[PDB]
Amino acid sequence: SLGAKPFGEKKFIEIKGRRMAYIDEGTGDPILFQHGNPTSSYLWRNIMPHCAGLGRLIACDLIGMGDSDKLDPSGPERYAYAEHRDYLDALWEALDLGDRVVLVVHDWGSALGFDWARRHRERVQGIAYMEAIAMPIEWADFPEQDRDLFQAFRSQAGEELVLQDNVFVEQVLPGLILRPLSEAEMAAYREPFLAAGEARRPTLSWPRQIPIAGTPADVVAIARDYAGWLSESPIPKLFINAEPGALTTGRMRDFCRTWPNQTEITVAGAHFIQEDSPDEIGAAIAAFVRRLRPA
Numbered sequence: 001s002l003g004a005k006p007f008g009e010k011k012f013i014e015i016k017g018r019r020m021a022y023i024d025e026g027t028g029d030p031i032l033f034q035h036g037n038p039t040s041s042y043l044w045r046n047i048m049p050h051c052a053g054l055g056r057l058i059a060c061d062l063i064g065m066g067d068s069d070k071l072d073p074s075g076p077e078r079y080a081y082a083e084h085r086d087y088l089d090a091l092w093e094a095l096d097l098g099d100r101v102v103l104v105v106h107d108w109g110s111a112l113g114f115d116w117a118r119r120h121r122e123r124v125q126g127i128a129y130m131e132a133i134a135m136p137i138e139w140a141d142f143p144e145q146d147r148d149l150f151q152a153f154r155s156q157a158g159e160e161l162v163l164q165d166n167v168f169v170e171q172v173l174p175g176l177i178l179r180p181l182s183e184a185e186m187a188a189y190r191e192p193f194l195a196a197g198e199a200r201r202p203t204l205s206w207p208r209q210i211p212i213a214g215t216p217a218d219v220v221a222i223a224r225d226y227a228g229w230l231s232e233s234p235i236p237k238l239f240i241n242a243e244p245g246a247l248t249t250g251r252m253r254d255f256c257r258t259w260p261n262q263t264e265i266t267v268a269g270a271h272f273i274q275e276d277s278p279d280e281i282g283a284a285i286a287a288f289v290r291r292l293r294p295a
């Protein structure tokens, strides 16, 4: 169902001097849900229930996001993709996941998840993805409605737009959910970013990492690697498509449809589809896991 309550209480693990937060409920092989920008584990609160009894349900909060500690010093060079990966690789190692992990990913959680899978292919039982960064793109592939705003985040205007005005949280987030959110839901997303300044840096560093028109070259190279790999991987996949969707449309959606051993469903939503169609998403993920783990 819909609802504002979180799925569980956060547990914490020390990673490289910082405390990282995550939800971890149940037992069994892991079903790992990874949020992206400007969200946290809260994104999956109404989807995880569908997998009750199917595995150890885990949702990690990326460094500087959700209830995971903020990095200090922080500034323009902080919270880039490689730094997020360094922290997340360590947390996932610390979680003792074993070799039958089902990844459920979104946005930057998909770039991080796809990259981890390419590097630990034998430990990945299945991948469910939605509104993902499945390959490097061009501006022509970016949703028309926010193209100018995202070019702005990537310019020097970003510090004012995000560190001062918190536009990713206050405007982009609700602007890409079809239904109006309650105050409690909005409060959950605003919480890690209530403070003006560096506390909001993760939500500005992220759009500056999207692999568009070849920049930043480093993330473009990483996405090219996992795109090439996924397009050829026999690992079972669940493509949770969205209408109208946002990122995974046009060229990128056509490319994802060429991926092998994949099942697809379409749900109503723009980018943060978990807020619009949680039960349809959860049900398909549960059906996918039951197929992968015949009881």
Ligand SMILES: [Br-]
Pocket: 037, 206, 207, 208, 210
């Ligand atoms: Br972003």
Ligand SMILES: [Br-]
Pocket: 214, 215, 216, 217, 218
């Ligand atoms: Br570059």
Ligand SMILES: [Mg+2]
Pocket: 017, 018, 019
């Ligand atoms: Mg500490």
Ligand SMILES: [Mg+2]
Pocket: 066, 067, 191, 192
């Ligand atoms: Mg906090």
Ligand SMILES: [Mg+2]
Pocket: 140, 141, 142, 143, 144, 249, 250, 251
């Ligand atoms: Mg398009």
